[PDB]
Amino acid sequence: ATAAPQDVPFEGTLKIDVDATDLQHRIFKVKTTMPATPGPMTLLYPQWIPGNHSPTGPIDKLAGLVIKVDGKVVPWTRDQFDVYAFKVDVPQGASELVAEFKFLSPQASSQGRVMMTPEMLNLQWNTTALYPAGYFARNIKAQASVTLPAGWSYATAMETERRVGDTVTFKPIDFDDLVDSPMFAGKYYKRVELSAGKQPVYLNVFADEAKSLDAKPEQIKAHAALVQQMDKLYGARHFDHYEFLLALTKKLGGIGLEHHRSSENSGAPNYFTEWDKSWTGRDLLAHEFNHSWNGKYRRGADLATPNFNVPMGDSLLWLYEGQTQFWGEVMSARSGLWTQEQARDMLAGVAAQYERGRPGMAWRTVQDTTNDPTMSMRRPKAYRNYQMSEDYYSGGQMMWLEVDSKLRALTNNKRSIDDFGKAFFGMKNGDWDVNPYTFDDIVSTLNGVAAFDWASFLRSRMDGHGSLIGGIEANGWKLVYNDEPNLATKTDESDDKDASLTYSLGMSLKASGDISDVLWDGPAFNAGLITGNTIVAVNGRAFSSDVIKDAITAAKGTTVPIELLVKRLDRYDTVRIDYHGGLLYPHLERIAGKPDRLSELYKAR
Amino acid sequence: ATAAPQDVPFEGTLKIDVDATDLQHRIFKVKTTMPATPGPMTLLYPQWIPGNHSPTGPIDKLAGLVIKVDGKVVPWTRDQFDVYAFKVDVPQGASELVAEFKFLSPQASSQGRVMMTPEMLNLQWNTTALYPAGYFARNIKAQASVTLPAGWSYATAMETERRVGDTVTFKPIDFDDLVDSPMFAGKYYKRVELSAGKQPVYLNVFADEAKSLDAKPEQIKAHAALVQQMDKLYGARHFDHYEFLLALTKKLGGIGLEHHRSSENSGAPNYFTEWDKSWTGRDLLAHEFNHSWNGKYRRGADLATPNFNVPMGDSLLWLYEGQTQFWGEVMSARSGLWTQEQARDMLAGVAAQYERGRPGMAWRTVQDTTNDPTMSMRRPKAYRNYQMSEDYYSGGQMMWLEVDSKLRALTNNKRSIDDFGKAFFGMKNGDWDVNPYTFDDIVSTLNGVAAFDWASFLRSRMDGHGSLIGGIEANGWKLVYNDEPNLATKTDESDDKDASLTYSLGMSLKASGDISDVLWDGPAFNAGLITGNTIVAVNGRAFSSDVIKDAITAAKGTTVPIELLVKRLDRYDTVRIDYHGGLLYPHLERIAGKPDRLSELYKAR
Numbered sequence A, B: 001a002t003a004a005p006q007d008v009p010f011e012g013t014l015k016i017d018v019d020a021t022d023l024q025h026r027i028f029k030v031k032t033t034m035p036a037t038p039g040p041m042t043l044l045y046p047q048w049i050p051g052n053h054s055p056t057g058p059i060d061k062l063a064g065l066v067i068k069v070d071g072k073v074v075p076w077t078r079d080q081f082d083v084y085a086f087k088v089d090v091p092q093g094a095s096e097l098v099a100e101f102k103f104l105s106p107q108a109s110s111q112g113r114v115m116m117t118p119e120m121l122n123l124q125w126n127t128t129a130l131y132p133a134g135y136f137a138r139n140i141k142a143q144a145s146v147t148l149p150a151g152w153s154y155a156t157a158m159e160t161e162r163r164v165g166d167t168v169t170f171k172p173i174d175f176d177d178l179v180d181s182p183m184f185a186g187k188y189y190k191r192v193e194l195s196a197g198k199q200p201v202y203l204n205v206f207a208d209e210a211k212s213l214d215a216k217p218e219q220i221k222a223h224a225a226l227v228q229q230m231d232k233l234y235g236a237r238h239f240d241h242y243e244f245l246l247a248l249t250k251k252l253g254g255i256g257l258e259h260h261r262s263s264e265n266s267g268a269p270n271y272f273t274e275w276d277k278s279w280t281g282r283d284l285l286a287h288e289f290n291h292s293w294n295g296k297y298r299r300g301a302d303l304a305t306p307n308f309n310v311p312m313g314d315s316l317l318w319l320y321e322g323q324t325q326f327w328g329e330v331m332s333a334r335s336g337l338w339t340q341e342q343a344r345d346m347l348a349g350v351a352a353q354y355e356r357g358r359p360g361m362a363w364r365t366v367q368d369t370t371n372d373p374t375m376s377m378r379r380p381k382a383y384r385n386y387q388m389s390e391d392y393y394s395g396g397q398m399m400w401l402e403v404d405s406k407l408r409a410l411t412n413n414k415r416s417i418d419d420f421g422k423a424f425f426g427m428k429n430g431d432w433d434v435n436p437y438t439f440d441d442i443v444s445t446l447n448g449v450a451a452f453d454w455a456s457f458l459r460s461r462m463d464g465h466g467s468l469i470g471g472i473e474a475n476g477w478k479l480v481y482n483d484e485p486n487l488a489t490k491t492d493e494s495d496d497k498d499a500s501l502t503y504s505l506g507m508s509l510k511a512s513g514d515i516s517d518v519l520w521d522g523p524a525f526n527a528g529l530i531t532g533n534t535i536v537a538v539n540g541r542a543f544s545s546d547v548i549k550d551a552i553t554a555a556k557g558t559t560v561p562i563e564l565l566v567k568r569l570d571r572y573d574t575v576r577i578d579y580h581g582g583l584l585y586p587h588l589e590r591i592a593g594k595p596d597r598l599s600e601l602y603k604a605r
């Protein structure tokens, strides 16, 4: 076992030098230099990574580790009860320890998200760092450098000291901020100012091909409007400057990861060039940006750990991620990243997910899903709808919508969730240290906006099994289903011609006919169907998405079952599904006579 | 978080009832009943599973959990710092707790190994169990039952009380032995006696199709000879009876998992029907059977944990798995499961793997690979040859071969590793409780066979970076390479037309030309190639395994480089490989002047 980290000074500087030039093998070469204290010394590879809420440190990708003290090799021994901890014996009279190793980043998605391509790379300093055990991470002064592919541009919130040729030397920085200061680099780069002033915000775009960088003025303006709308909500910025990192790519592994003064984001090459086709993911930058307030600056006390190698407590992720999921979609509408119609159909899809798409809510609480990061590490699960899957995101969002609606009702619409945002995250402009909070702090700040038993309200939703969608009705709308496609579903289905049929047949299909998801206790489930089975034919006709949708519509209101020819492994059988509700996709409709608070919430300030 | 398990009596019986009939959804339905006193109670889902040496308990597949005390639901709360631990409050006057849940076994291999098919199933009791925290697992008396698909046969070492219809009630058993008593069930079943007597051994075969069960007399005899050869080695059996469980299948997930009185094994449907083609995997039953002595009965003290929810120490896996890997191959030859020529070429491949196929030994020791189970959980890695990958298996095997050769050299061939086997595992016939050992015990028993500094010998090999293949030459043979295919490689290549070129071009390829492996610092590596790249053409000719092999031979002894057309993502380039050694496959050849101890080692006793 590794001794607990202590809030004591670390003498000297942890030097971290990274060679990021072996794009072909996708290898980051690392040298870490630090003072050596005589006696046993334990070095740690970061395990629990802020923003991942789970022990995602890729320990088995650390290879070629050789440790030398004052130029002599010393053998290392891994702690079999802490496989992220390497112990060496430092001789008496020693001065300096050097550890050299390689981070073997994924050569295919099966190994994790790809971090190197022929045109760009993603350096996450936790993957290229060893640091001494026994210290709070913030007490370790670090100084990093990286050697880039020839002539590549780079971007990071971390301040550059100098670039000599292709070796970038950064100014000293605390080790926790180093891990929190990722770098993108690439040959096709555009830097766009989103906000000038004393706390400026920039957008750093890297692409597989330069043509993807052609952001149009109104599209840049929508990102600039995001910054303005966050200013209206919070009244403060928790950074001295902010660097959006955005990779437009089909080669780099997808990412959305927040930091204090930056975020790592990926989109498709058509993020800008096909604005109307790429909209469903455009809440990404709003989401990760919001975390600078909600998650990085303010963090649950059980989540704000002293180093990267003690476990994180995720109990409050329904605020961290849940309210950020909420604000990401709201701010997308307020900024023009989304249209109001797009944002409303997205919210309808969230509401339907918890009204009808989450039968696991009968036995599992949203609170318990804050354990999903460590339980599952986002590995494949058979029934996201019944096992549940990180619903502290979207279920949390629905609770925060209801919180907004209740604040309005208590105050005759003079207060809203905007007032909680300013009160809870708006203090101490410019500070980007960690300001921890507890559950009781959430309650007290809500009670300060409008007096109410908020503790019971939050517990009843997060520890309950009942409806989470009450914020829809209270804010003047109603969740409905009809045969009109949901804007998000339609965009997500089309071009590949897939078929999302969650609320009719209780399954989703690829264009090939392969079932990609099955709703627990739904019609497909009750025919014994599982993901991976194939719908070969519908009423005798070779499967297509149009064919099965037409058959569903033809069965609406009749008593003639839909006949599905199914391939299960190497067997074929025909099932008859007595489903006659037609195609059903969620939308929101106004409740006439009630105030439309929802549109006010989603309106630009 | 969770209180430590104590060696104190457990009052009552843990009843575990499993319904294994939902083959379509692949769901095991579970009811666990246990004594309960009022107040706080913590229930555990097994986490660290004996024989996996890592926390493989599938916690995220436990769904639908409802806990009732005296018929009334009690809410449960998971420990966010121990996600395998469930906490409830037991009301006053209660005597009994009932927990019901479902184990959602993998619906595809991406979720883990498949455990249900239309013809067979594999029940592992740890996946269908909750048990009270605070107790040594061996102190908990359990009693299990299972409801099978209609008419299915079953086999397990656990003794049956009665079968009523399709519900099997088992006799009470200690909870640790329950977890150690898996069950196979299926519609195509054959039971074969391998040894009669007071400690009988049976082979239980389940198949996708009945024709695969047609074991011929000489093939059954080889399995009977395996039991006889183990008797000669150890002189004792650590079980009152033993049940081989063997699944001949393309649908059940592959498995080799040892137990005290049974093992879980899978083979191809042609395990018997194409005996000469399916030979490379036939050390499986010899391997897992050997674990009844080495691993189950004798186990490292740091591995022999008190329950399933504290971490296991794997430091001695180079004995547990390493010597079992050794005996699995030796016993295949001694029993006739393998021919002597097959076993020799298999050993040649192991020797070559550490002579030339493990460049990672320059920085990592075999000892450190005992941490790979927890580090990697057998997830994909880019360079098994450089990161290393559980080399305590085959590297351990090579060390034990050298131990054998050294015992012979010290004793003028009067003692061998067979004497260590009998001395270390041959005590206490009939005993199948765990008999722990430490490193010092290994040393003392070796020293008792022949006096020598065995501690330094073992450490020099397991903590070193040098050669592990010294036992080959010491026992009278020499590792050589030539263009004659290795029998194991040829069989593993055949039918699919793959190309293993580790010792020539430093890579392996599928018939498609996709690179499946790259040797660190080898020729393919030095051309920048990675797994997933595709060799499109060789000297301009469309790739095939024969085409690239012919080109390698054509380049032998010349100065004309091999031209490879390569697809890297969406780009094509041609590389010139200056490799002129020809095809090189490992074999063993006699050193004519030296005594042939290797053949003695592999000879039937």
Ligand SMILES: CC(C)C[C@H](NC(=O)[C@@H](O)[C@H](N)Cc1ccccc1)C(=O)O
Residues within 6 Å of the ligand: A051, A052, A053, A054, A254, A255, A256, A257, A258, A284, A287, A288, A291, A321, A373
């Ligand atoms: C591309 C998007 C879907 C990315 C999105 N990212 C986020 O929500 C971030 O704010 C999360 N902090 C990223 C995260 C959370 C838990 C475990 C691993 C990674 C996510 O769901 O991971």
Ligand SMILES: CC(C)C[C@H](NC(=O)[C@@H](O)[C@H](N)Cc1ccccc1)C(=O)O
Residues within 6 Å of the ligand: B051, B052, B053, B054, B254, B255, B256, B257, B258, B284, B287, B288, B291, B373
């Ligand atoms: C089919 C064969 C390859 C199976 C073989 N099984 C064994 O060696 C058993 O003795 C191991 N005890 C199985 C094992 C070890 C570590 C982690 C998971 C599972 C294995 O390598 O897993």
Ligand SMILES: [Zn+2]
Residues within 6 Å of the ligand: A258, A287, A288, A291, A321, A324
């Ligand atoms: Zn987030």
Ligand SMILES: [Zn+2]
Residues within 6 Å of the ligand: B258, B287, B288, B291, B320, B321, B324, B325
């Ligand atoms: Zn084994």
